[PDB]
């Protein structure tokens, strides 16, 4: 029953990574895997984001 008024504790550095890679990637879309913590239920936290390999994906 995760039905709540939930939250995400982002990390601005990961925001920087996202803008860095999508800003000047291929004209297509990019996708990767998070690195944070399922800290709680009614919120969550994020800290880290790695860059992704360039394998033809979506």
């Amino acid at each position: 029953a995760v039905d709540t008024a939930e939250q995400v504790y982002i990390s601005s550095l990961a925001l920087l990574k996202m803008l860095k890679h999508g800003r000047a990637g291929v004209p297509m879309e990019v996708m990767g895997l998070m690195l944070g913590e399922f800290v709680d239920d009614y919120t969550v936290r994020v800290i880290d984001v790695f860059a992704m390999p360039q394998s033809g994906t979506g």
Partner: protein
């Protein structure tokens, strides 16, 4: 500084032909600009002893290559386009 900086930068000199070490600021309290860069230098003396490599002040400045302030600006929530002169003067 400490004593190793030179040896460290010269070890890594193989990687970058002009390798840099930067005295980085962990507490922004400066009057002006934070951390600056120091490239390999050959500046021994008029004496001209065996070449010291204490890396000189290789000037630089805060380059914002791209805006990307879609979030960065979205973080400031403090300032405007200061149409401020007095601030500059006192500083």
């Amino acid at each position: 500084l400490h004593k190793n900086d030179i040896a460290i930068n010269e070890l890594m000199k193989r990687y970058c032909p002009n390798s840099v070490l930067v005295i980085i600021d962990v507490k922004p309290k400066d009057l002006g600009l934070p951390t600056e860069a120091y490239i390999s230098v050959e500046e021994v003396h008029d004496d001209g002893t065996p070449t010291s490599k204490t890396f000189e002040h290789v000037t630089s400045e805060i380059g914002a290559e791209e805006a990307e302030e879609v979030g960065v600006e979205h973080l400031l929530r403090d300032i405007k386009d200061t149409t401020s002169q007095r601030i500059t003067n006192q500083v």
